[PDB]
Amino acid sequence: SFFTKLTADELWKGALAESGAGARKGRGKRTKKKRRKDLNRGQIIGEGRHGFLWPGLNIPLMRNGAVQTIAQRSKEDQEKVEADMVQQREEWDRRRKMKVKRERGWSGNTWGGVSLGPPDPGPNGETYDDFDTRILEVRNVFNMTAKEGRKRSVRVLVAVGNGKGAAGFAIGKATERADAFRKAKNRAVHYLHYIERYEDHTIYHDISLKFKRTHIKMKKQPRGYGLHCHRAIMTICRLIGIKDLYAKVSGSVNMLNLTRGLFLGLSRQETHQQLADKKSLHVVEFREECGPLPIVVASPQGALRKDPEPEDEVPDITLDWEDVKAAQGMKRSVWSGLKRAAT
Amino acid sequence: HRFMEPYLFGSRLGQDIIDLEQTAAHLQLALNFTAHVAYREGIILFVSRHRQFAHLIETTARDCGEYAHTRYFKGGLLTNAPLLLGPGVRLPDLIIFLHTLNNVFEPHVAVRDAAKMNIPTVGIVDTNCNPALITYPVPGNDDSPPAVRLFCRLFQVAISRAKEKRRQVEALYRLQG
Amino acid sequence: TVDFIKKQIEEFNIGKRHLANMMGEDPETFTQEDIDRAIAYLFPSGLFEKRARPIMKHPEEIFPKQRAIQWGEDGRPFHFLFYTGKQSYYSLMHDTYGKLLDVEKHHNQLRAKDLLAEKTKILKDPIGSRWLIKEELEEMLVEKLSDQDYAQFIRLLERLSALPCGATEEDFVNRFRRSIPIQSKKQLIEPLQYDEQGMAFSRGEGKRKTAKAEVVVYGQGSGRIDVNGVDYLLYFPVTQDREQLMFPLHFLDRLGKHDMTCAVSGGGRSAQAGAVRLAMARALCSFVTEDEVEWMRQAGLLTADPRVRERKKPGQEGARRKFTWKKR
Amino acid sequence: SRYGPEYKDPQIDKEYYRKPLAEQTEEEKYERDFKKTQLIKAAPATKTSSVFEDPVISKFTNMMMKGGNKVLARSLMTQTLEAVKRKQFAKYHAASAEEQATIERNPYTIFHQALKNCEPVIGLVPILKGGHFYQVPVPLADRRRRFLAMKWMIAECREKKHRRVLMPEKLSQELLEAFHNQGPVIKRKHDMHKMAEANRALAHYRWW
Amino acid sequence: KNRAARVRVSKGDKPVTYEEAHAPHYIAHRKGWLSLHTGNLDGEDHAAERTVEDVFLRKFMLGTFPGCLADQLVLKRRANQLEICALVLRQLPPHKFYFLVGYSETLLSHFYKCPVHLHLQTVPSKVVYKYI
RNA sequence: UUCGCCAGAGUACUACUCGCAACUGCCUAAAACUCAAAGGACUUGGCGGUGCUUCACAUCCACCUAGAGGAGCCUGUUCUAUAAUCGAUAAACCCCGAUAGACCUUACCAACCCUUGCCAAUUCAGCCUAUAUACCGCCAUCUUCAGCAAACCCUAAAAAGGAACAAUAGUAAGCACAAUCAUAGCACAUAAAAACGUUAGGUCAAGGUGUAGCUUAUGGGUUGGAAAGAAAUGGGCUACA
Ligand SMILES: [Mg+2]
Ligand SMILES: [Mg+2]
Ligand SMILES: [Mg+2]
Ligand SMILES: [Mg+2]
Ligand SMILES: [Mg+2]
Ligand SMILES: [Mg+2]
Ligand SMILES: [Mg+2]
Ligand SMILES: [Mg+2]
Ligand SMILES: [Mg+2]
Ligand SMILES: [Mg+2]
Ligand SMILES: [Mg+2]
Ligand SMILES: [Mg+2]
Ligand SMILES: [Mg+2]
Ligand SMILES: [Mg+2]
Ligand SMILES: [Mg+2]
Ligand SMILES: [Mg+2]
Ligand SMILES: [Mg+2]
Ligand SMILES: [Mg+2]
Ligand SMILES: [Mg+2]
Ligand SMILES: [Mg+2]
Ligand SMILES: [Mg+2]
Ligand SMILES: [Mg+2]
Ligand SMILES: [Mg+2]
Ligand SMILES: [Mg+2]
Ligand SMILES: [Mg+2]
Ligand SMILES: [Mg+2]
Ligand SMILES: [Mg+2]
Ligand SMILES: [Mg+2]
Ligand SMILES: [Mg+2]
Ligand SMILES: [Mg+2]
């Protein structure tokens, strides 16, 4: 009956049935676990159930200068060795049954907002250690192929940033989730924006941007107002370096369009220095706390025009009913003045 | 083109005329920038997709000691450099366009890829060209044999003088100590 | 990988010396054919694929052509056409076009001066010259090539060859020329033999459908055929079998002018007749001049018959007749 | 399929080779024939250089062979020609001086004339139009016409004879009948011609 | 689809040896037989007696050298003495190598009543021929 | 700058009101109840009894040859009938597992016997018990179709696609095809090979097997029987001369 035995690899290949015909299309996943254990992990070659000690395998060749003969362990010593090899199995099972935990980004069972680690270094040798990345969107996209039918590709929208004002975003799509993560990490660095941050905590001016179908309204906020933004804009601005900001998104809430519009608006900012250059006038900041003190932030380098700007008695600005309601105190919604967690 | 309006003098019975005042003003900076890159040991590549004078472009580039591309431009040439050219290569530091349009009358691949890879581009742009992406555009004529020969000779001597004066600067550097 | 090949050179050389020591031949006179015989004797691997046999050759013969370093330590590429993808192919094309323009200018000056001293060297039919195939261009230009680019290069070479040629460009084109062997399919004619006071003697061998036939022909005897010790009429009672025998003799008008003995083994009644026909045709070449041998081979007497019985395939009846296939 | 595309068909005619000098247009072909390094197929066993054999005779013998027994079919031709000869000789010797100048004694000529008389002029093809099959009259090729003429006689002599009647004797009867245009194969031919004339108006369905 | 003695192609990362990289329709064409003897000839006998020993040797050597066997055994049979050519990884120390070689050279000889040679070739790792 | 409308879908160009030469009508126009969707555009497959070009080489017709379906016999199935295996059972089953059944084979049944019961030992052996809709090992099929595919790159976003040779974003290891090899000289031909996947295709009964079940029995031995054809059908042999 010895010729009826096979190799452990062949036994495991049939036991786990990893290449089953029912697991191809997707009929499986009902019992989603496939664990294979190597039986030769802690198996010392010379030891056996009889407890024989062989001079070539178990015990050394020479003792006290003389040759060792074939020995056999005592009944109790063999039982001690047996207890050791048994307790090794409980130790390995204790290591196996425990799950290494993972930080949750936004919820306990979503990929959005989790840390993925620094991206891989480039070919020339540049290493991105200060850069940090966060998963923004994950999606199991399906395609229709003639033979297989449903083709499952994991696609991820992922943004990278270092915290010094340089950040970017890109999409990685692959058959495997780990491959998609790696592709997104390696492709996000190549598309990096620079975000002009006034005093390194907030944007220069309020931005009202209209993307494809996503409206974003972002207002400059004080030092004490830390990132009361959407749950994805907060992550993006945390990667960028913005510590103080308020954002409201209206219309479509698509993640890709939201990120694209956010980056476009953050890149289309106007620095005080460029405003002073284009209008040949001094830019003076009037802090509410500092009273009427004329704080100067940027100077119009070049020709300073002595002709003053036309003072408009009635400004023709593009106002919004949302901010008018906010200013008039008509915002009676219970969802606006709630107490939320910190940054 | 809609973006050639400021670079034109007028229209002579349907045919538009390019004023040469801004042509020379642009060409001074173009030649200065081309010569400085050669002086600072930079890779200069002449991209030109035109099946009439291509031989002249490779001859000019070989005499200059710089590189040329007048054949069909492959897809990932400038972007997928670690695969199309070799394991680790050096990207061209300057791109000279003698014909910004290919045989399809579409904008060239290299003018977009240089902007993608942050590679300076100096280019002779005709009335139907798009100068928005070219770092140093010079409005001129790229279909006249005398015009293209003039441009090729100017860019030949601009590189030759830059390299030679680099050699005498190094010679004086050796005598400095 | 240049140093690896360099080390393979010295390893191959020391192995060659040791192989010469093993065989006892002079290492100075020890050559590649001797290496092949020595390996075939020491390592007698019986395999149907010759490439799987143990082989010991020069490293530049075993390993493919490796690309040289394309740039220096400063990063600047050596060739000026490096950024075109195929520097060697495009350099070849550039050189060919430069020489075309040089020839055009020189011929224009010669025509202006009214001097026609060139000749037409394009027709090399008696030499059997052909153009390089894509493989022969790929072994020269180490990088990969394309069919359209190869066709463009060939069409440019035709333009170059269609112009009045000088000295250097003809030699430049000549390295892209391959000579073919003589496709002359004339057969070898067996010389007339004289054996034991017998004149006009010859022999022939034929084979058709597992039937081997030897024909011994005397050109000095009367017209008769003796098959396996008996007469041809007795051996071939069928009229068609005797018509096969008359087919070679009647074509050459040698019916009653030759005495022949035929010995045929294997096959059936008609296979033996066909084999004897083929052997007789191959034997009657010596007694006739050359212009009739070609007529005979164009009539089909000097060509063998490869129409053999095909092996029966599993699942079928007669190697073509399949089983009764029921649709439902 | 053992013969490659480069193999060409052999030429059996001796007179084709015996006089090369009498013409130049045909002189220009055979030198290239062998100077192009062209391979030639082996001559088939059924076709030889005999002056007494005919391609029509060989075809009609091939069409009679059942299974693979070629010698039986060659015999059946032997007795068919012999019986036609002997019946015509018996008729020859029983007539007056005027009829011997008209009665033919040549079985080969009689067989060829019988085939020409039995050769149909037009054939019919079923064409599907409007879900129904219509018998459209169509001109036939020379090989198709001769094949029909041969097959009709073979089929008639195979089935419409008594068991005591032998194939060569029945074929000798029908050969002499078809020579004088009084045999049932001529009736079959005229039936096909009449059925084509009746549907002549349906010939517009053909598109070739 | 034929599946006998064939390792299936993965995404392009599996290391496959020369023996496994060739389908059985390449035997005697590109790769040779793993065992040589006289019982498979035409006018010879005792084929099954050697075949059963061949299979037992494969299994016994696989169990004797656990995890360090690189390729399959080469079983030579030449004049009453059978030679076993093995490719073994250098996982065990030479002291344990020499115990097992001497053990087998006598146990197999006493179990088959015929002299047995054991030859080991130590490889640093499994040699990869096709993609890895 | 204005006017008229738009508050999920079905109910619903509906019921009930007003008005109208309209009386099976027109305009305005709900509710009860049901669902968590209803919708617009698009990408790729698949299909098309849509249309247009190149084809079929034993292949569709035009056409050639020899047969099946008619008879007997052999044999394999579906049915009845028994105490009496099983699986296959559209192309891809039906002289198929089986290159093979008087006891054995034989896993089926009826009578009887043994239960640490092949092995050195094992609160152990052993099961042809169920699951081929968990498998491995082995194959059928598209299939002599050429595509599959790691690493990359591009798209005014990307579901996905990636080509113009006088070339407009494509490089691409590899597996296929091709090449090579065998049928002992070439060519042709044959053989062989044919990847990723489709049919939850066939095989727990070549063999091992995850899971769920038997242990004085679904286990292990002896003897005897496993018919028979009311009937239908597939494939061959013999002929009908
Ligand atoms: Mg949770
Ligand atoms: Mg929503
Ligand atoms: Mg132009
Ligand atoms: Mg047959
Ligand atoms: Mg409603
Ligand atoms: Mg209505
Ligand atoms: Mg109504
Ligand atoms: Mg058919
Ligand atoms: Mg029959
Ligand atoms: Mg029947
Ligand atoms: Mg059954
Ligand atoms: Mg069943
Ligand atoms: Mg089926
Ligand atoms: Mg029994
Ligand atoms: Mg029985
Ligand atoms: Mg049982
Ligand atoms: Mg299945
Ligand atoms: Mg292909
Ligand atoms: Mg894609
Ligand atoms: Mg590839
Ligand atoms: Mg051969
Ligand atoms: Mg072939
Ligand atoms: Mg096959
Ligand atoms: Mg092949
Ligand atoms: Mg099933
Ligand atoms: Mg089943
Ligand atoms: Mg089992
Ligand atoms: Mg079962
Ligand atoms: Mg029956
Ligand atoms: Mg069958």
TrEMBL record, chain A:
It comes from the Eukaryota. Residues 19-41 are annotated as: Disordered. Keywords: Mitochondrion, Ribonucleoprotein, Ribosomal protein. GO terms for cellular component: mitochondrial inner membrane; mitochondrial small ribosomal subunit. One of its GO terms (molecular function) is RNA binding. One of its GO terms (biological process) is translation. It is found in: Mitochondrion. The keyword Ribosomal protein applies. Residues 131-195 form the S5 DRBM domain. Transmembrane segments: none annotated. This is Small ribosomal subunit protein uS5m. The chain holds residues 88 to 430 of 430 of the full protein.
Automatic annotation (TrEMBL), chain B:
GO terms for molecular function: structural constituent of ribosome. It comes from the Eukaryota. GO terms for biological process: mitochondrial ribosome assembly; translation. Required for mitoribosome formation and stability, and mitochondrial translation. This is Small ribosomal subunit protein uS2m. The keyword DNA repair does not apply. Mg(2+) binds at residues 126, 142-143. It is found in: Mitochondrion. It comes from Sus scrofa (Pig).
UniProtKB/TrEMBL annotation, chain C:
It comes from the Eukaryota. The lineage of its organism: Eukaryota, Metazoa, Chordata, Craniata, Vertebrata. This is Small ribosomal subunit protein uS9m. It is found in: Mitochondrion. GO terms for biological process: translation. The keyword Translocase does not apply. Its main location: mitochondrion. Residues 305-328 are annotated as: Disordered. Keywords: Mitochondrion, Ribonucleoprotein, Ribosomal protein, Transit peptide. GO terms for molecular function: RNA binding; structural constituent of ribosome. The chain holds residues 70 to 397 of 397 of the full protein. Belongs to the universal ribosomal protein uS9 family. GO terms for cellular component: mitochondrial inner membrane; mitochondrial small ribosomal subunit; nucleolus.
Automatic annotation (TrEMBL), chain E:
GO terms for cellular component: mitochondrion; ribonucleoprotein complex; ribosome. Keywords: Mitochondrion, Ribonucleoprotein, Ribosomal protein, Transit peptide. Signal peptide: none annotated. Coiled coil: none annotated. It is found in: Mitochondrion. Its main location: mitochondrion. Belongs to the universal ribosomal protein uS3 family. This is 28S ribosomal protein S24, mitochondrial. It comes from Sus scrofa. The lineage of its organism: Eukaryota, Metazoa, Chordata, Craniata, Vertebrata. The gene is MRPS24.
